[PDB]
Structures are given as structure tokens and as C-alpha cells.
Amino acid sequence: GHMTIARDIVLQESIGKGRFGEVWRGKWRGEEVAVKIFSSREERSWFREAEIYQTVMLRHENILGFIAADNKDNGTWTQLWLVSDYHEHGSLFDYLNRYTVTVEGMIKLALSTASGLAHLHMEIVGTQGKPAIAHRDLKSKNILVKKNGTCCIADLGLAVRHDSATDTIDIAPNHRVGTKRYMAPEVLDDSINMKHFESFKRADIYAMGLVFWEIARRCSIGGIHEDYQLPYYDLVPSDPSVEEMRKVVCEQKLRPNIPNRWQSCEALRVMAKIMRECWYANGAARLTALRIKKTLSQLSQQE
């Protein structure tokens, strides 16, 4: 038996929870793995996340490495498991709360996030290809930081996949599925055309712009940085409702504040411009993830 299976994994430490499912650090044949455990009544959530992670050609350095979906019967109840690579730093939210980053550090985190999102969004046509995938719940709590200071995207259970041969989405999408704070203006006001797959890619870009703002605040230059905050910390309460968000984002047209200090550093000027070009109310005007990856690659090369 060479493949990783649940019976061979020993849970060691509780490390957190997702929307559904609890995440643990475990050991499989001497190596650390992350295990997301679901109950029997959460089978639909577990299966859908397993289905997205098993998508052909999905693997990428900036997408969480999937190992297996399996079941584990303890003799009383059955647990449904998703097993993946383990990343000791945890989420970008945990990482940015604990640490400040260098200019190099910021660019590495942003470029890797854009590279993972560009791979998710990328379609390779044909049966032996890859369908384009939109995340629908991108946020700093769903992006993990690897040992090398680069990111990988996780929590793919709310994703939607596009079949170009039929121009259809693999599921009948429900409105407003993700984290309210990161919902795009068109999702908040329900103007999004959910029959057009590009709509979901564009909504992910708005959320990525919010995550870039979170990283940039933590970029320390000459010992100067901002404290950790979630986007809209200055305008909405914790656990904001759709109505609270829509009033700020759609009606008042506010976005997270871009400090004047970011114009004094080239890397921060480039990041700020990307944010503004992710935050347009018109999803069609936003940058693509591939374009952001190209801009940040040019910046990482120049540094």
C-alpha cells in the first residue's frame, strides 16, 4: 500500500475549523499532514470539496496540495476526511497578525496568491484539459503560508467550475455564498449575472485586492508599518451582515483606505495600483489574475 489512506494517519493536534469540518495536524508514515474532518451529515460539503480538489490538472505550487478523500470508522461513527499537505504557519490571516513583512516578503505573498488564483481561473480546453474554477470565498483566512514565505490557496468547497464545450457552470449557484466582508459589490447588491462564469472570476479578483491590502499594511519599511486589520475594520462591525456591507461598498462606494506613505515606495505604489484596479465596482474593468501575476513577476524580477 503506497497511497495515503486515513487508517494510517494519527491525529496529533487541533489546529482550527473551516465553514464545515475541523482541521487537525496528523502524521502519516512519519510525515505531517493536515486533516479536515467532517461528520456523516456534512457529506455534501465533504464530497463537493473532494470533487474540486480532484479536478484534472489542478495541482500547482500555489494551490493547497491535496492527498486524499477517505472515510474513517471509529467503531461508533464514521468521519469523512480530506487530507492535504501541512503548512505550519497556517493562514495568511494568522501569519499577518503575528508578523510584519519585508518588501521582498510582501511581493512573495502577493505574487504567489495571484499565481495560484491565475491557475485556478485558467481553462485548458479538451477532455484531457482543465476547467476554469472560481473560488467564491477567497480571504486571508483561506490562504496558507508555506515555509518558503509563499502562499497556497485552500478551502475550495464553495468553488464553481466552468465547462466551455457547453458554456455551463457545474452547479446551480446560490446567491451570496461566501464571507460577507469580502463579497464583491455585484454580489452584495445581487446585480451579478450568475449565468456568466466570468462574473465569478471577477468577484474573486475584488476579494484578492482586499487580501493585498491586508498584506501591504504589514509591510515594514524603515520600521514603519500599519497594525493588522481586516478590510472594512473602520466601517462595519465584526461579523457584518450583507446589508451593512452593501451600504458601505455599493451605496457609499467606499473601499479600504490607501495610506499616502504607500506612494513613497515603488513596491507599495505597484500594490496600491493593483488594489484600485481590483476594486472597481464594474467587474469587467478589473485586472485579471494573469495580468496581476505578470505585473508582480516584473516587480519581483526588478527587486
Ligand SMILES: Nc1ncc(-c2ccc(CCO)cc2)nc1C(=O)Nc1cnccc1N1CCOCC1
Ligand atoms: N493545510 C493546512 N495546513 C495547516 C493549517 C493550519 C496551521 C496552523 C494553524 C494555526 C493554529 O494556531 C491553523 C491551520 N491549515 C491547513 C488548512 O488546510 N486549513 C484550512 C482549510 N480549509 C478551511 C480552513 C482552514 N484553516 C485555515 C487556517 O486557519 C484555520 C482554518
